[PDB]
Amino acid sequence: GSHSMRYFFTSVSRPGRGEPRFIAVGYVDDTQFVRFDSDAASQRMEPRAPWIEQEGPEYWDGETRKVKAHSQTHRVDLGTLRGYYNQSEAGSHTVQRMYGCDVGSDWRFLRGYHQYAYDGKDYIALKEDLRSWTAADMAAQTTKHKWEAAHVAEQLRAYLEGTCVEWLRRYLENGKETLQRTDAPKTHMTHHAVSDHEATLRCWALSFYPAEITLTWQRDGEDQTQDTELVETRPAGDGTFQKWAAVVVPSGQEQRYTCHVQHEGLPKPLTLRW
Amino acid sequence: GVTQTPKFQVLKTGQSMTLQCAQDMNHEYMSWYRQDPGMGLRLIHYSVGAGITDQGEVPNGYNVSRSTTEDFPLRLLSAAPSQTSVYFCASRPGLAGGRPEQYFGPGTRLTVTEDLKNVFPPEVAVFEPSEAEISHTQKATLVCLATGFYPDHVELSWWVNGKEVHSGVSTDPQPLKEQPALNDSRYALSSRLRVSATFWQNPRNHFRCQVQFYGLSENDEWTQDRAKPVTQIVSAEAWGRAD
Amino acid sequence: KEVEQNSGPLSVPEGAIASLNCTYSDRGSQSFFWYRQYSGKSPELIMSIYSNGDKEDGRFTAQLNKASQYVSLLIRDSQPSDSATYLCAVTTDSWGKLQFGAGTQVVVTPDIQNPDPAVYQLRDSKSSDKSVCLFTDFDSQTNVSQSKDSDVYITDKTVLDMRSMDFKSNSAVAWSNKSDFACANAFNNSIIPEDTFFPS
């Protein structure tokens, strides 16, 4: 298996209404396991997957304290950034961060990243080498220097190449049943039409996990997917995902068209005929 | 780095005192600890930012402020013999820049007595090397001796021919108690300065054993028969004999 | 107890190896440190480890085993100057508390060559009370007893260095004020070899 842990932090400023909103979420593959919402009740880091509840006081206390530190660094960044770009206190602004690490089928380090965005676009990001930084504007450049002189990349690398993979594995094990899972997509094929001159055929992939999947419409070699409508893979609500693709095919040629399903829960790529 | 004053302090149950501490590293997290023999370090109060202060493991009896990010004063409002310990101040980067590392200040030794009547400056005394030693080894061992002082707040040093030395200096790491029964007890500290006979035999070189004692301040209520045990410098001397 | 440290006094001769162990409880810790505290001084930071593996600076060598939650410090090529007590610290985050272990003292013993055990009685004038017994040039192994009679004071063995000659001499002193006091007896309550040069 190729697994990962990702943390997503979004911070939105609220000119005139108080402290910015702060949401923090944690995953392992496509399963969220913790959350923190400055709006919620507890004001603590909360479990969001069953396999993480078993960790004790020590864990939540710490996890909670850290997330509060994260919000702090963010509460301020909004202020700091608003400055770099001399923006008015009148508008709302967003900051998002995300960092994590991937492990190979051996559960050893592979990749690690820490991306930072402000108002929707990259501000700064750590390079694959976890030693260098990348900046977008003259503004985001100031930040870079302030992190090259303070040795940020350093710390991240240690965490990213260590604690991250270390804990990921821990999670992967404690959640053997829930995460080592490979739910195969249950297939379907629907044909509808407005009235002659064409068919509306949709290939259907349902109840699959993880979300990694690729649907292709091909007529024995014809690259039809170039003119196929595919919807974003969407969540079912019970841990699995759904997705579909369709093409407007001239009544008649529809039987020559075949759909291709690609998912890690399938030995051989499925080919459905009409 | 981290600086803090005073270095030594004597007080009697009831007196208030404030231990000053500062850091010029632009750190957000400063803490106050107290070190006791059977306890190692123990947190008292700490602060993760300006205008913020929350208690630690043994906050009882101590007050603390943080109006500025540079200073973090520890305040005792009414002393007590249980507050007798060594105080270390420590700053930490926190959420600012720098390698996550806590640095300790120099520290401050305090001693609180029921009665100030007990503060005693030492009596220094240099002892001429042993005729045998000189003869037998070809080296000279001088022993200084600060005695009957209290509290254990002394800075001892040797000075030959007008200059301070370390060469053969080797004082005790900690004072001795001259009655392990009183907590109004006195101390005695020893020290050695070994120099070859080639030196000590020269009649024109002078050795002095200086001891800095930290005690009560100049204008300080007292009148008991003595001499106000003030912060003094009690020395002893001996000249290089001819023998 | 969050952090457990080695043990009591760890004696090792000059040039040897002084290894220290450290063990913690909180699974989430991510930063480990090694401070050095010289008697009557403040703790001084000497080692920081933020990753699993071995790190080296000068004569130190730190190891971190997160799986066993164990930390190390090996002092190569020891010097008496290394004598002090070493504190182990561990933390989880920026806002987490720093946790030190009780620390482990390390008494680095010097390499004495031509031992000259001896007990010299020194002298002073009107300075006051007592004369003084000096116990010097014995072997680092020779431990020293204490005041077996409160009325008499005895110090601990300290190592002095005479740089210009590369020559150390362990020494300890004793004093008291009674016409019943002397140097020969001042230490009889201490394991001294029959190599006692006793000037009289």
């Binding site: 943390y7 944690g26 880091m45 864990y59 996890e63 850290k66 997330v67 530190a69 994260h70 702090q72 660094t73 963010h74 301020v76 960044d77 700091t80 950034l81 960092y99 930072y116 501000y123 700064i124 930040t143 302030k146 992190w147 303070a150 940020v152 710390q155 991240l156 965490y159 604690t163 991250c164 804990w167 | 959420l95 600012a96 820049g97 996550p100 | 989430g28 991510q30 930063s31 933390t91 989880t92 985050d93 920026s94 987490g96």
Partner: peptide, 9 residues
Amino acid sequence: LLFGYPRYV
């Protein structure tokens, strides 16, 4: 398990 050393920008 969250990172323990956020840094301002």
